[PDB]
Structure 1
Amino acid sequence: DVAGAVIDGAGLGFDVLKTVLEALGNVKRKIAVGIDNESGKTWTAMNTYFRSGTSDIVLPHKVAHGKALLYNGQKNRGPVATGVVGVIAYSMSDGNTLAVLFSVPYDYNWYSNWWNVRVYKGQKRADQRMYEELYYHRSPFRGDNGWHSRGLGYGLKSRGFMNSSGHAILEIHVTKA
């Protein structure tokens, strides 16, 4: 149960993500991310785009139906104080792309936690433009310590939870609609 790994989806919960979170050490801004694939189809990792921060971890390469991937990120170590803000992109075996946004900002005087989930038609890499769409234009969810559900189209739906703090967990379940 480490970041970079896949577990059984039914075992995804706050406990597993907290353990991933706690393993990163005392850093101001950091995130544990778990995405449970119940979509009926296998996911293959494309890439992650980091608008801010980074990860030492490889995206789990293959994530089968019934499995959850565990991932994490943290703020830049270097001289520029950043949050951790990015987009994970997975290829689904229908030819389409599952994209997940997380934003855990540095400066809470101006910003707060957000996340989003969207299915993109065809094969699309995570990048700056994708981040802008998901952050500014596709109705992202607040990290408000509550669950939010939404149809993704393609017969899939998402149910997800993100906490409100700079020590952030993001838990998402992708199911059949």
Structure 2
Amino acid sequence: DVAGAVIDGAGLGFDVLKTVLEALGNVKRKIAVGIDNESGKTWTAMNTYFRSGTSDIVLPHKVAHGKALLYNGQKNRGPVATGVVGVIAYSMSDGNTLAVLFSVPYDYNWYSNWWNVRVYKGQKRADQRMYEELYYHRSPFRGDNGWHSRGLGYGLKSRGFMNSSGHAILEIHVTKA
């Protein structure tokens, strides 16, 4: 149960994600991400785009059906009042791309946690343009301590949960629709 590993999909839960958060140590803004692949396709890591922040973890390179990937991110170290915000992209064996936005801000007086999930047609790397699409145009979900579901198209659907604080857990399940 370390970031950068894959685990059995059924093993993914908030406990595993707190373990991942705990291993980052007591930094101010951090995220543990778990994505359960029940899509019937194999996923291959493409890249992570960071608007702000960093990860020392290599995306789990291959995520088979029935496995969950674990990942993390943290704010840039030092006296910078910024959070951790980015987009993960995995290529799926059907030729399309699974994209996941996460956004954990610095200042909770003014901003909140958000996430999103989308399938793109073709093989599309995560980048600033994708961040802008997922954040400003494709109806992101609040990290509001509740579950949110949506159909993804392509025979898939998503269900996920993110909490509201600056030590964020993001648990996502991708299933057949």
Q: Same fold (TM over 0.5)?
A: yes
Q: 1:117 Cα shift? A: 0.2
Q: 1:89 Cα shift? A: 0.2
Tell me the percent identity: 100
Q: 1:80 Cα shift? A: 2.6
- Which digits, 9 at most, give the CA deviation of each residue in 1:97-128, with x for residues without a partner? 00000000011122100000000000100000
Poorly superposed stretches of 4+, deviation over 2 Å: 78-81
* Residues in 2 aligned to 1:28 and 1:34: alpha-carbon distance in whole angstroms: 20
* Residues in 2 aligned to 1:89 and 1:95: alpha-carbon distance in whole angstroms: 13
- Which digits, 9 at most, give the CA deviation of each residue in 1:115-154, with x for residues without a partner? 0000000010000000011011100000000000100000
* Residues in 2 aligned to 1:131 and 1:156: alpha-carbon distance in whole angstroms: 21
What are the ranges of 5 or more consecutive residues in structure 2 without an aligned counterpart? none
- Cα RMSD between the aligned structures? 0.6
Q: 1:17 Cα shift? A: 0.4
Q: 1:79 Cα shift? A: 4.1
- Which digits, 9 at most, give the CA deviation of each residue in 1:58-83, with x for residues without a partner? 00000000000000000001443210
Q: 1:165 Cα shift? A: 0.3
- Which digits, 9 at most, give the CA deviation of each residue in 1:41-69, with x for residues without a partner? 00000000000100000000000000000
* Residues in 2 aligned to 1:120 and 1:111: alpha-carbon distance in whole angstroms: 27
What are the ranges of 5 or more consecutive residues in structure 1 without an aligned counterpart? none
Worse overlay, 59-68 or 104-113? 104-113
Report how many aligned residue pairs link the two structures: 177
TM-score (norm 1): 0.99
* Residues in 2 aligned to 1:130 and 1:111: alpha-carbon distance in whole angstroms: 20
TM-score (norm 2): 0.99
